[PDB]
Amino acid sequence: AENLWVTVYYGVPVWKDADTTLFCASDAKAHETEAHNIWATHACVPTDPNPQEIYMENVTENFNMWKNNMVEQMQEDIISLWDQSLKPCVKLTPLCVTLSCTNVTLTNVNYTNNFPNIGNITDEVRNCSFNVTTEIRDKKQKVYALFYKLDIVQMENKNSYRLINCNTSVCKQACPKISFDPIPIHYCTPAGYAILKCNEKNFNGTGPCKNVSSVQCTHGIKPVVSTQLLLNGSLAEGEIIIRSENLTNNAKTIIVHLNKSVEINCTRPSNNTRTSVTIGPGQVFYRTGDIIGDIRKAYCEINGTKWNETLKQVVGKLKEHFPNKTISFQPPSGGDLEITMHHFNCRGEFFYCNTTQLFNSTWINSTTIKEYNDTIIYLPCKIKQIINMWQGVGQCMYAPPIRGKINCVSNITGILLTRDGGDANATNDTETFRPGGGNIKDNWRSELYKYKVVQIEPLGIAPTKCKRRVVE
Amino acid sequence: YRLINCNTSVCKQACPKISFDPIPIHYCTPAGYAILKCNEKNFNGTGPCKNVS
Amino acid sequence: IFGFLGAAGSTMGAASNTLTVQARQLLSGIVQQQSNLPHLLQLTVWGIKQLQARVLAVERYLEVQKFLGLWGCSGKIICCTAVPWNSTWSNKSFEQIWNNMTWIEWEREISNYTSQIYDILTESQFQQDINEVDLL
Amino acid sequence: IFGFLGAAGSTMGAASNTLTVQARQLLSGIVQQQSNLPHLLQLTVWGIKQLQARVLAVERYLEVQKFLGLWGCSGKIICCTAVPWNSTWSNKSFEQIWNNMTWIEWEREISNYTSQIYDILTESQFQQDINEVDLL
Amino acid sequence: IFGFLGAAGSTMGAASNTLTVQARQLLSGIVQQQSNLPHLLQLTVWGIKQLQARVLAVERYLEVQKFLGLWGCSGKIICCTAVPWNSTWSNKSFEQIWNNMTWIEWEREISNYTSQIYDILTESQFQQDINEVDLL
Ligand SMILES: *[C@@H]1O[C@H](CO)[C@@H](O[C@@H]2O[C@H](CO)[C@@H](O[C@@H]3O[C@H](CO[C@H]4O[C@H](CO)[C@@H](O)[C@H](O[C@H]5O[C@H](CO)[C@@H](O)[C@H](O)[C@@H]5O)[C@@H]4O)[C@@H](O)[C@H](O[C@H]4O[C@H](CO)[C@@H](O)[C@H](O)[C@@H]4O[C@H]4O[C@H](CO)[C@@H](O)[C@H](O)[C@@H]4O[C@H]4O[C@H](CO)[C@@H](O)[C@H](O)[C@@H]4O)[C@@H]3O)[C@H](O)[C@H]2NC(C)=O)[C@H](O)[C@H]1NC(C)=O
Ligand SMILES: *[C@@H]1O[C@H](CO)[C@@H](O[C@@H]2O[C@H](CO)[C@@H](O[C@@H]3O[C@H](CO)[C@@H](O)[C@H](O)[C@@H]3O)[C@H](O)[C@H]2NC(C)=O)[C@H](O)[C@H]1NC(C)=O
Ligand SMILES: *[C@@H]1O[C@H](CO)[C@@H](O[C@@H]2O[C@H](CO)[C@@H](O)[C@H](O)[C@H]2NC(C)=O)[C@H](O)[C@H]1NC(C)=O
Ligand SMILES: *[C@@H]1O[C@H](CO)[C@@H](O[C@@H]2O[C@H](CO)[C@@H](O)[C@H](O)[C@H]2NC(C)=O)[C@H](O)[C@H]1NC(C)=O
Ligand SMILES: *[C@@H]1O[C@H](CO)[C@@H](O[C@@H]2O[C@H](CO)[C@@H](O)[C@H](O)[C@H]2NC(C)=O)[C@H](O)[C@H]1NC(C)=O
Ligand SMILES: *[C@@H]1O[C@H](CO)[C@@H](O[C@@H]2O[C@H](CO)[C@@H](O)[C@H](O)[C@H]2NC(C)=O)[C@H](O)[C@H]1NC(C)=O
Ligand SMILES: *[C@@H]1O[C@H](CO)[C@@H](O[C@@H]2O[C@H](CO)[C@@H](O)[C@H](O)[C@H]2NC(C)=O)[C@H](O)[C@H]1NC(C)=O
Ligand SMILES: *[C@@H]1O[C@H](CO)[C@@H](O[C@@H]2O[C@H](CO)[C@@H](O)[C@H](O)[C@H]2NC(C)=O)[C@H](O)[C@H]1NC(C)=O
Ligand SMILES: *[C@@H]1O[C@H](CO)[C@@H](O[C@@H]2O[C@H](CO)[C@@H](O)[C@H](O)[C@H]2NC(C)=O)[C@H](O)[C@H]1NC(C)=O
Ligand SMILES: *[C@@H]1O[C@H](CO)[C@@H](O[C@@H]2O[C@H](CO)[C@@H](O)[C@H](O)[C@H]2NC(C)=O)[C@H](O)[C@H]1NC(C)=O
Ligand SMILES: *[C@@H]1O[C@H](CO)[C@@H](O[C@@H]2O[C@H](CO)[C@@H](O)[C@H](O)[C@H]2NC(C)=O)[C@H](O)[C@H]1NC(C)=O
Ligand SMILES: *[C@@H]1O[C@H](CO)[C@@H](O[C@@H]2O[C@H](CO)[C@@H](O)[C@H](O)[C@H]2NC(C)=O)[C@H](O)[C@H]1NC(C)=O
Ligand SMILES: *[C@@H]1O[C@H](CO)[C@@H](O)[C@H](O)[C@H]1NC(C)=O
Ligand SMILES: *[C@@H]1O[C@H](CO)[C@@H](O)[C@H](O)[C@H]1NC(C)=O
Ligand SMILES: *[C@@H]1O[C@H](CO)[C@@H](O)[C@H](O)[C@H]1NC(C)=O
Ligand SMILES: *[C@@H]1O[C@H](CO)[C@@H](O)[C@H](O)[C@H]1NC(C)=O
Ligand SMILES: *[C@@H]1O[C@H](CO)[C@@H](O)[C@H](O)[C@H]1NC(C)=O
Ligand SMILES: *[C@@H]1O[C@H](CO)[C@@H](O)[C@H](O)[C@H]1NC(C)=O
Ligand SMILES: *[C@@H]1O[C@H](CO)[C@@H](O)[C@H](O)[C@H]1NC(C)=O
Ligand SMILES: *[C@@H]1O[C@H](CO)[C@@H](O)[C@H](O)[C@H]1NC(C)=O
Ligand SMILES: *[C@@H]1O[C@H](CO)[C@@H](O)[C@H](O)[C@H]1NC(C)=O
Ligand SMILES: *[C@@H]1O[C@H](CO)[C@@H](O)[C@H](O)[C@H]1NC(C)=O
Ligand SMILES: *[C@@H]1O[C@H](CO)[C@@H](O)[C@H](O)[C@H]1NC(C)=O
Ligand SMILES: *[C@@H]1O[C@H](CO)[C@@H](O)[C@H](O)[C@H]1NC(C)=O
Ligand SMILES: *[C@@H]1O[C@H](CO)[C@@H](O)[C@H](O)[C@H]1NC(C)=O
Ligand SMILES: *[C@@H]1O[C@H](CO)[C@@H](O)[C@H](O)[C@H]1NC(C)=O
Ligand SMILES: *[C@@H]1O[C@H](CO)[C@@H](O)[C@H](O)[C@H]1NC(C)=O
Ligand SMILES: *[C@@H]1O[C@H](CO)[C@@H](O)[C@H](O)[C@H]1NC(C)=O
């Protein structure tokens, strides 16, 4: 008892929660391809080929979504990368001039390979021949170009149009040599901190976790951007998870995460031709010259029966949080373009796919089976070139035209939902959900939901029986 | 006629204040690093140097 | 044999023989590499966070050294000075602490008497050393 | 007790009982906080100057540690070694120094041979260890 | 009698007598001074190239300090641990080593065992004082 003396330690395994700053760590093989990517640029430190998944079993830590500080740092990182990736590129300020458009006349093919039989792209583009100066500022020349209708608005005086963006900002066009390929990114903490990963399978969004696993840093994170549906995400292993801080509250979104994937198949079957027209001293502009050959609206193909199965599963899962209600889906109820659409960027081109017929259903009691046979679901999708991925924090951007044929497949993981309010007796035991919505952060909170940065405090201290010797 | 480079890219006029005179520079490494200097006279591209200081 | 941080949930007594694993990874990580391959990569927003990452590594490790330096237990892993422990911070016995209560809980249990103790150690070291000069 | 620099004018002897307070405050400071709220806050003029402060903080502590590291008694407040005086850097006796001369003035008198003092002190520590290696 | 790296080519036996002169210059350097005159003076490439130089100076030096800290040889140019050489790493007799086996190529011969010697030494220090903490 009387021989209890302080005994300082060093290297004790004790952590306390805090917030730090991370850094990129790209994959070794996925890097050094002379691609000049936007997100995972050449400045990332090479990753560790042998990450350690050290299993701290016998313990408990309180995780939390909707407050994980890591989302803010990487969101700011994505914004900064997107902003600096446009600084070297050229502006488009000489283009804000009145246009003299005309609806399209051309000697194009008529066979059209009409298997989709949905519709050719008449009235979807406008032949607009504007008039801007050449290198010498004293001379102007007439140049014609093809623009989509989403990039063009009319102020007054019909038969005279203008660019849409010219009353809010100026949109620098993308440099043609940089691509938007989503490279996996491994966020790694500086030495001295650590990242805790909750290894539970059926992990609900918040609350304590009792199977914590520690790693030096996280795995690859896809920087893909989307609006209404998650793309190329990481599927959960246990079962379908419904994530929400307050399901009762309807002021926010609801993240739905699947454990069975669904493949999307969307492509643009028509060629555009790339023709370059100078605008001034050392400044060049890439325009869609004249479409030739195949003419069809870009469409997406999705296995219908897989969609029916996934809808049945998610309805079954939501059947426990709303024990007696009736669940049905409806298309987006309005607003700005992204929410009322499906937005995803592929191969340097932005897509706005309607995807209305994917959310027209009513499930009552699972009494009768929706027995139908395999018919693929085809949905239209416009194409937009003057993009504004963020409201006012990002820089408005103009993707250059891409020639040839665009064909990429995505393979879907997550769905964004939103509850709808109602009364007590007015409701007919029914709750309706509408997809769409959600900011960019809502995409990332579906992936960084397992990690929490911690700081090490190796200064332990505890009584013992020592007594440091005296020097005579 | 017109300027040869006014069309290919942008050209700037250097301010007269800044001078192009090459001033000698001494490169110096941070503490913890040493610079090896071969004082051998007939030293071509590579090969061991036995007179380095 | 354990891994890094691999016994935090274990009992304190059985977790007192794996400290070297944690103490061996305070600086040795991945930040030491400059870049994958060298237009002024030092100013890219990705490259401006290593500076925040690198200086945070040392500035977090030095704080450990400063406290170890003054207490006289510098250059050791498990040291022990000769300042009494009057039990007002924790009056539990020898066995009730070491064998059963885990490390994380113990650190939280006295987290409000630390600042008083951290000042006691240095003063105990200093006045003890004053004896040495006043001894020879 | 005395606070920071609380006895800079007091005598030599009475200023030997306040060393611990100043040693503690050699790295602790408000610069630890990153920012009140984190466009381009990384390269903001209030940010570039703050980073310079953190680097200068560690380099000023490391400078003292490195010299005290080599002198063979790392991890102590006061320390005496085996280098006898030549009695020409300061030809004053004991009581004439520790009673009535002050620290600030004392440094000026001896500031003229420190570059010949730090070097000779280090050699003694090295010399002691050389005799020890061939001893056992 | 030897300057910086003076005896790096000399034999094993006579090289040890100049360890200090190659140790005083691990942090001191030209970087101490500020500049010729203090545009973008703080944002020029040398405004950041110099900053990159300072942070590498402390990090590279202080990394070595980490290994000295664990082994218990802190504050000693020459140390003496208690890890018995088992003759597996290199079985040259003592005469064959310190007579005419020069330093620069010495530890390149042992270069496949650095990753384990730097680990077995840590364990030896740990096992020494765990016996001591239950002996006093
Ligand atoms: C979710 O995950 C899904 C699974 O991975 C993912 O789907 C995959 O998405 C990637 C997207 O990168 C697909 O890879 C691309 O496929 C492109 C197909 O292009 C067709 O059309 C071309 C004509 O434009 C044809 O030439 C081409 O034929 C061959 O092309 C490739 C040769 O290796 C090969 O991939 C093809 O299969 C085929 O063999 C094809 O018919 C392909 O073009 C593209 O290559 C680009 O990227 C490579 C990697 O960086 C570069 O090495 C390559 O050179 C191409 O980059 C060029 O173009 C970029 C702009 O587009 C520039 O930034 C580059 O710097 C480079 O630019 C040079 O060339 C330009 C002309 O092209 C020229 O203008 C420049 O000046 C410069 O000279 C890439 O391989 C993949 O196929 C998809 N998976 C499947 C199964 O289909 C999905 O995308 C994910 N979801 C999301 C949202 O991302
Ligand atoms: C995605 O496709 C659906 C069709 O499957 C589109 O819904 C249809 O949109 C058009 C106009 O865009 C509607 O036409 C008119 O709508 C008014 C609305 O009050 C209606 O009263 C008129 O009688 C007229 O039909 C149409 O009703 C509507 N629904 C159907 C079944 O055709 C939808 O607009 C497409 N997505 C987007 C973003 O446009
Ligand atoms: C888009 O408009 C341009 C002109 O505004 C059309 O180009 C004209 O093509 C005819 C056919 O050979 C020429 O005689 C004219 O001289 C062209 N006008 C020019 C070069 O200014 C173009 O055909 C139109 N394209 C579509 C699809 O309507
Ligand atoms: C590009 O040149 C054409 C040809 O001159 C312009 O068209 C006419 O321009 C004159 C000059 O002011 C106007 O008075 C006419 O009214 C224009 N024609 C029509 C049908 O409106 C054209 O305006 C020039 N481009 C721009 C952007 O002004
Ligand atoms: C904590 O989660 C891990 C998952 O990584 C569990 O480890 C798996 O357990 C299952 C049990 O059937 C094995 O089939 C797997 O091989 C294990 N490893 C992996 C990587 O899946 C672990 O069991 C969980 N903790 C507890 C106490 O059950
Ligand atoms: C993917 O998750 C779904 C549900 O999230 C799983 O469907 C359930 O599977 C369990 C075990 O097979 C059954 O007991 C349930 O009845 C299923 N749910 C429904 C509504 O029928 C599905 O099994 C998971 N897939 C895999 C491969 O494990
Ligand atoms: C994604 O969609 C494209 C077109 O929508 C598919 O390309 C078709 O592939 C089939 C079989 O490979 C061919 O018979 C068609 O002629 C192709 N059409 C076109 C327009 O290219 C592509 O196969 C789809 N991807 C996957 C994985 O099924
Ligand atoms: C869409 O998915 C369904 C199942 O999710 C596929 O149906 C299966 O098809 C395979 C081979 O085609 C059969 O062996 C299974 O018995 C089928 N199962 C069911 C439940 O139908 C369907 O083939 C897919 N559609 C396409 C076009 O591939
Ligand atoms: C896209 O979703 C599909 C759905 O399974 C994934 O396809 C599997 O990917 C793994 C990883 O290489 C393969 O081992 C499987 O063989 C693939 N399935 C088939 C049927 O071949 C795919 O991994 C998903 N995309 C990404 C990027 O993970
Ligand atoms: C800038 O102008 C120069 C000359 O005015 C261009 O150089 C000539 O370009 C023509 C094509 O228009 C070629 O046929 C000649 O061979 C070029 N001259 C030589 C000496 O090779 C140059 O291409 C123009 N550049 C831009 C970007 O407009
Ligand atoms: C988690 O804590 C429990 C609590 O004691 C540990 O249980 C003991 O584990 C040791 C390990 O050999 C056994 O000898 C004891 O018999 C177990 N019971 C008791 C009451 O001590 C368990 O081992 C701990 N797990 C880990 C990984 O440390
Ligand atoms: C390089 O090696 C030569 C070998 O001859 C060294 O010269 C000998 O040095 C030892 C110790 O200094 C003397 O005892 C011998 O008398 C020397 N012999 C000759 C022939 O010079 C030389 O000293 C070595 N280099 C250095 C810097 O020590
Ligand atoms: C373009 O299409 C619209 C809608 O079909 C039509 O009113 C217009 O007349 C067309 N263009 C021309 C030049 O007629
Ligand atoms: C194709 O576009 C033309 C206009 O160019 C239009 O008249 C026609 O109805 C469209 N569809 C088909 C099948 O030709
Ligand atoms: C998360 O889901 C589990 C699963 O049963 C449930 O017990 C718990 O109440 C949920 N936690 C929150 C915070 O919703
Ligand atoms: C699209 O590719 C080229 C590019 O313009 C074009 O000549 C060709 O006719 C188109 N493809 C087909 C199958 O017609
Ligand atoms: C999915 O269900 C809806 C109604 O629940 C039905 O109309 C549709 O045909 C089903 N999908 C397929 C591919 O049959
Ligand atoms: C899908 O079609 C329209 C789209 O608004 C909607 O009124 C309808 O109720 C939905 N369901 C079915 C089965 O048509
Ligand atoms: C699909 O619809 C019904 C229900 O399965 C079936 O009788 C019909 O023959 C199927 N269609 C084809 C083309 O096989
Ligand atoms: C070796 O280097 C020194 C450096 O000053 C030079 O003077 C000498 O000529 C060189 N050669 C020999 C053989 O010393
Ligand atoms: C420790 O103190 C608390 C209250 O101060 C008391 O309840 C407890 O019995 C004490 N335990 C011992 C072992 O003295
Ligand atoms: C060990 O601690 C637990 C709570 O942490 C307590 O329930 C138990 O009684 C303790 N046992 C002993 C012997 O101290
Ligand atoms: C320390 O401060 C907390 C904060 O209110 C207080 O609740 C607690 O009683 C104090 N003492 C201990 C031993 O935690
Ligand atoms: C025990 O030590 C603490 C130091 O935190 C002190 O405040 C308290 O007065 C001491 N108790 C006695 C009886 O001296
Ligand atoms: C005093 O120190 C100097 C070096 O500053 C040294 O040269 C001299 O020998 C010393 N005095 C005596 C008596 O040794
Ligand atoms: C000590 O110095 C003071 C002046 O600073 C002087 O008055 C006093 O006489 C000195 N003491 C002795 C013993 O000389
Ligand atoms: C000597 O120690 C090394 C440690 O790396 C080990 O690999 C080797 O087997 C040991 N040899 C003997 C004979 O113990
Ligand atoms: C001593 O080392 C040499 C070379 O490394 C080797 O050939 C010899 O067998 C070794 N002797 C013993 C006894 O291991």
Numbering used by the authors:
A (entry chain A): 31 to 136, 136A, 137 to 188, 190 to 309, 312 to 321, 321A, 322 to 355, 357 to 405, ...
B (entry chain F): 191 to 243
C (entry chain B), D (entry chain N), E (entry chain M): 519 to 556, 564 to 661
From the paper:
One major challenge is the extraordinarily high level of genetic variation among global circulating HIV‐1 strains; up to 30% differences in the envelope glycoprotein (Env) which is the sole target for neutralizing antibodies (nAbs). A lineage of J038 bnAbs is now obtained from a long‐term SHIV‐infected macaque. The Env from a CRF01_AE strain C1080, which is one of the most sensitive strains to J038 neutralization (IC50 of 0.095 µg mL−1), was stabilized in the prefusion‐closed state using the approach described previously.
We also obtained cryo‐EM structure for J033, a member of the J038 lineage antibodies. The structure at 4.75 Å resolution showed a very similar binding mode to that of J038. Among them, two (J033 and J038) of three most evolved and related antibodies showed broadest neutralization activities (70.6% and 76.5%, respectively). Initial negative stain EM indicated that one Fab of J033 or J038 bound to each of the Env apex. In contrast, J038 and J033, which had short CDR H3, bound to the V2‐apex without penetrating into the apex hole in a similar manner to VRC38.
